[PDB]
Design a binder for this molecule. Structure first.
Ligand SMILES: CN1[C@@H]2CC[C@H]1C[C@@H](OC(=O)c1c[nH]c3ncccc13)C2
Length: 268
């Protein structure tokens, strides 16, 4: 009925490319990913399965001609990457809260049999209230179907965040790989630096971690409680690595640290 409701104005580049679109009538804002096709089909397929408060919502897609348009939830708070101060990190309570949200989105994805495969702060967006949303399903894949798990063998992700088994073994389970990358995200949030270029024995920093030299750089800035959690996540053997139900029972994970979002108040 309402005439111009279908019209959106592209008002600025978000990050092919991602543009912030504003509805001509309602002024509602959305993110539109523009893909110059000249992959996307699986990405759209995966996005259509997604419905969770900590995952970037998918509204629909349009094909036009050669250009695909994916309409996505707009996250006005930007990337988590931008909340991390170099060499510093961010306050521990904030990092714990973003970590709880990340785990909720991850548990959700794993519950529907989807692995993200590229968890890193650039792909973790923040809404108006600083709620974390996992974004970008371009590298994602189905690891469980009809209740049968399928082992992965494709190498993908981003080196500093990738699990050591991706570099060492021909086949590997999907879930511990996403867990590992969440541990590197946590390290980055608490230390403002990535511990190594890649998790290989040839990598000095990685070999120092395995030798437990936690008096060295990233680790020394941490704090014993979250550092004990990182000792359980960044375990080389994916079979020994802590799983999410267990992360949820971790001492630091459950430590009260942060006050809820402050709400207006007066005195009399
Ligand atoms: C590294 N990338 C850049 C930024 C996040 C990840 C995937 C892609 O953005 C989106 O898909 C966004 C969806 N909703 C958004 N709201 C605000 C900014 C980006 C997006 C491009």
């Amino acid at each position: 009925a309402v005439p111009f409701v279908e019209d959106w104005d592209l008002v600025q580049t978000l990050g092919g490319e991602v543009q912030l679109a504003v509805n001509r009538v309602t002024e509602e804002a959305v993110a539109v990913k523009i893909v110059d096709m000249k992959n996307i089909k699986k990405e759209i397929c995966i996005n259509k399965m997604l419905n969770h408060e900590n995952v970037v919502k998918f509204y629909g897609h349009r094909r036009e001609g050669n250009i695909q348009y994916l309409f996505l939830e707009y996250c006005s708070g930007g990337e988590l990457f931008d909340r991390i101060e170099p060499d510093i990190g961010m306050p521990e309570p904030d990092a714990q809260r973003f970590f709880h949200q990340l785990m909720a989105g991850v548990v959700y994805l794993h519950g529907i049999g989807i692995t993200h495969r590229d968890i890193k702060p650039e792909n973790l967006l923040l809404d108006e209230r600083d709620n974390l949303k996992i974004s970008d399903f371009g590298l994602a894949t189905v690891f469980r179907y009809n209740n049968r798990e399928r082992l992965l063998n494709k190498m993908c992700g981003t080196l500093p965040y990738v699990a050591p088994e991706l570099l060492k073994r021909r086949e590997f389970h999907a879930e511990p790989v996403d867990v590992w990358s969440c541990g590197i995200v946590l390290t980055a949030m608490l230390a403002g630096e990535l511990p190594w270029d890649q998790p290989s024995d040839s990598c000095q920093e990685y070999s120092d971690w395995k030798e437990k030299k936690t008096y060295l750089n990233p680790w020394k800035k941490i704090d014993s409680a979250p550092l004990a959690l990182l000792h359980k996540i960044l375990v080389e053997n994916p079979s020994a690595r802590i799983t999410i139900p267990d992360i949820k029972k971790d001492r630091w994970y459950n430590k009260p640290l942060k006050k809820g979002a402050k709400r207006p108040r007066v005195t009399s």
